[PDB]
Design a protein that fits this description.
The chain is mainly beta. Helix content is 4%, strand content 56%. Strand 11 and strand 12 form a beta hairpin. The PDB classes it as hydrolase.
């Protein structure tokens, strides 16, 4: 049983898979109230009821990203032992990720249910910079838009509640200190079960970045991690009540 009630990181093992969970309030300067993240062997849950919020940097827009992840998160220079990542993008034949989720939140709160990876030039960087790429996949959003601008749409299949469907995904792109790409599902899902192959998003990102002057040799980058969580808040958010539950998690990485 893992229980955290303040920002921090703990490793755990779920269905035989080594993982890290981070009660991540990375852009919050100060807060009052409670946060609690728990793994009990069957599910990971997160709940927050916080007030007196202010951002460390309003230019980054969101306030936090409570999440769990598989692999090496560059910003925290951390990976649980036993992960198959990082591996070069070119060595990934397929990477299926499956998870059930139930997300709740007060109506006005900016929030998403987003998964992501960081593709870096070296295997164990401690930050992303020019030449690196952040790729997100958003299954749900409320009062929150990705960064950058919407440039394209892609039709990418996934299995929703056990049924294969064709999702329509908008691709937003931004050139900041690193390249940011976010694929946002046009029909957001707040609760359900999803299974998909991360390779389809890598393939679409490689194409979208094929003419970039910043990103070179996309397939030689290292696919470092796979994070699953909920970003939340905006620079005007003063209090936040929300939570989530993740269950039935599995992955199949073919390298
Ligand atoms: O930086 C170190 C820190 O990173 C954390 O990971 C962050 C990424 O750094 C961050 O790029 C990403 O957040 C995006 C978010 O998806 C967008 O919704 C938001 O969009 C804004 C945009 O910025 C505005 O220009 C526009 O007008 O409005 C939209 C919203 O409507 O842009 C942000 C930029 O932050 O999210 C990742 C997770 O939060 C790591 O988790 C942490 O450990 C690191 O310390």
């Amino acid at each position: 049983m893992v229980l955290m009630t303040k920002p921090g990181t703990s490793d755990f093992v779920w269905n035989g898979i080594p993982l890290s969970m981070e009660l991540n309030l990375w852009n919050i300067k100060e807060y009052s109230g409670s946060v609690a993240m728990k793994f009990d062997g069957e599910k990971i849950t997160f709940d927050a009821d916080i007030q007196n919020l202010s951002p460390k940097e309003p230019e980054r827009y969101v306030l936090g990203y409570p999440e769990f992840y598989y692999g090496y998160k560059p910003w925290e220079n951390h990976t649980a032992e036993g992960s198959k990542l990082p591996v070069p993008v070119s060595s990934m034949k397929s990477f299926s990720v499956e998870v059930s989720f139930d997300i709740h939140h007060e109506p006005s709160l900016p929030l998403n249910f987003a998964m992501e990876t960081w593709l870096t030039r070296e295997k164990y960087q401690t930050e992303a910079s020019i030449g690196d790429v952040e790729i997100m996949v958003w299954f749900y959003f409320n009062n929150l838009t990705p960064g950058g601008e919407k440039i394209e749409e892609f039709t990418i299949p996934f299995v929703l509640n056990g049924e294969s469907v064709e999702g329509t995904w908008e691709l937003w792109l931004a050139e900041w200190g690193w390249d940011y790409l976010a694929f946002r599902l046009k029909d957001p899902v707040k609760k359900g079960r999803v299974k998909f192959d991360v390779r389809h998003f890598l393939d679409a990102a490689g194409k979208a970045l094929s003419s970039s002057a910043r990103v070179k040799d996309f397939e030689d980058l290292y696919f470092t991690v796979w994070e699953i969580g909920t970003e939340f808040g905006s620079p005007e958010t003063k209090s936040a009540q929300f939570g989530w539950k993740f269950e039935n998690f599995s992955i199949d990485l073919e390298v």
